[PDB]
Amino acid sequence: VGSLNCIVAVSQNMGIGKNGDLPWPPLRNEFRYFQRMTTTSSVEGKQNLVIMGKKTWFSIPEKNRPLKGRINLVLSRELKEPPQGAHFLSRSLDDALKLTEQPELANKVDMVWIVGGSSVYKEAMNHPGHLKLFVTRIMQDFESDTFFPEIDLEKYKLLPEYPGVLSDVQEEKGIKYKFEVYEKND
Ligand SMILES: NC(=O)C1=CN([C@@H]2O[C@H](COP(=O)(O)OP(=O)(O)OC[C@H]3O[C@@H](n4cnc5c(N)ncnc54)[C@H](OP(=O)(O)O)[C@@H]3O)[C@@H](O)[C@H]2O)C=CC1
Numbered sequence: 001v002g003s004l005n006c007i008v009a010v011s012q013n014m015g016i017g018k019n020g021d022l023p024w025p026p027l028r029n030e031f032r033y034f035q036r037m038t039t040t041s042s043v044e045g046k047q048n049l050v051i052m053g054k055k056t057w058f059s060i061p062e063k064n065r066p067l068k069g070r071i072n073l074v075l076s077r078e079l080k081e082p083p084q085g086a087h088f089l090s091r092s093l094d095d096a097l098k099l100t101e102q103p104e105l106a107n108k109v110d111m112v113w114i115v116g117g118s119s120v121y122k123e124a125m126n127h128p129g130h131l132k133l134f135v136t137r138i139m140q141d142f143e144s145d146t147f148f149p150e151i152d153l154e155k156y157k158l159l160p161e162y163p164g165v166l167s168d169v170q171e172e173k174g175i176k177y178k179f180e181v182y183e184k185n186d
C-alpha cells in the first residue's frame with residue numbers, strides 16, 4: 001500500500017469518545033462525510049478497506065456492521081478471529097497492510113482508511129510514507145474519555161483547501177465544525 005488515510009472528528013478539548021460512543025449528539029452531514037470519504041473507491045471492482053480497533057467496532061451500531069460498501073478489518077491482540085460481521089482480523093497495523101498484498105485481497109482493495117481509535121490513529125500517523133489525515137474540528141468542548149493524539153506539525157502540514165472537501169465552517173444542531181486535511185509525504 002502506497003498511501004494511508006486517517007479520518008476522525010475531534011472536539012476542542014481533543015475528545016473523540018465518551019462511554020463507547022461519540023461525545024456529541026449525532027451530526028448527520030458529518031456522518032455522511034465520513035461515509036463518503038471512506039466508501040468512495042476510484043477503481044471499478046475494488047472497495048476501500050477500513051481498519052479499526054475493537055472498541056470502535058463495537059461502538060458502531062450493530063444494524064450497521066459491517067460498514068456497507070467497504071471491507072471491514074478489526075485490530076486485536078486478543079481475539080482469535082474477526083468479530084461476527086467483520087471481514088478480517090489482524091494483530092497489528094503492519095499485519096493488516098500486509099494482508100492487502102496476500103492472494104485473497106490481491107486486487108480487491110483501493111484506498112485504506114484508518115477509523116480509530118486512539119492507539120490506531122497514533123500508530124498510523126507515525127507509519128512511513130504518504131498519509132492524509134481528515135480531521136473534523138468540532139468547535140466546542142465536549143466531555144470525553146477517549147482523546148486524539150495531537151498532530152505533529154514537524155511532519156504534517158495543514159492543507160489550506162482541498163478538492164472534494166468544504167472549507168467553510170459548517171453547522172448542524174447548533175454545533176459548529178470545520179473539515180481539515182493534513183498531509184505528510186514520507
Ligand atoms: N470521534 C471519532 O472520529 C471516533 C471516535 N471513536 C470513539 O472512540 C472510542 C473507542 O476508541 P478507543 O477506546 O480508543 O478504542 P479502540 O477502538 O482503539 O479499541 C482498543 C482495542 O483495540 C485493539 N487495538 C487498538 N489499537 C491496536 C493496535 N494498534 N494494534 C492492534 N490492536 C489494537 C486492542 O484490542 P485488544 O484488547 O483485543 O487487544 C485495544 O484494546 C469510542 O467511544 C468510539 O465511539 C472511535 C473512532 C472515531
Ligand SMILES: CCc1nc(N)nc(N)c1C#CCc1cc(OC)cc(-c2cccc3cnccc23)c1
Binds near residue numbers: 021035059060061
Ligand atoms: C462519523 C463520526 C466520525 N466522523 C469522522 N470525521 N471520522 C470518524 N471516524 C467518525 C467515526 C466514527 C465511529 C462511528 C460511529 C458510528 O455510530 C455511532 C457509526 C459509524 C459509521 C461509519 C460508517 C458508516 C456507517 C453507516 N451506518 C451507521 C454508522 C456508520 C462510525
Ligand SMILES: [Cl-]
Binds near residue numbers: 166179
Ligand atoms: Cl476547512
Ligand SMILES: [Mg+2]
Binds near residue numbers: 066068
Ligand atoms: Mg453499514
Ligand SMILES: [Mg+2]
Binds near residue numbers: 018022023142144
Ligand atoms: Mg460528552
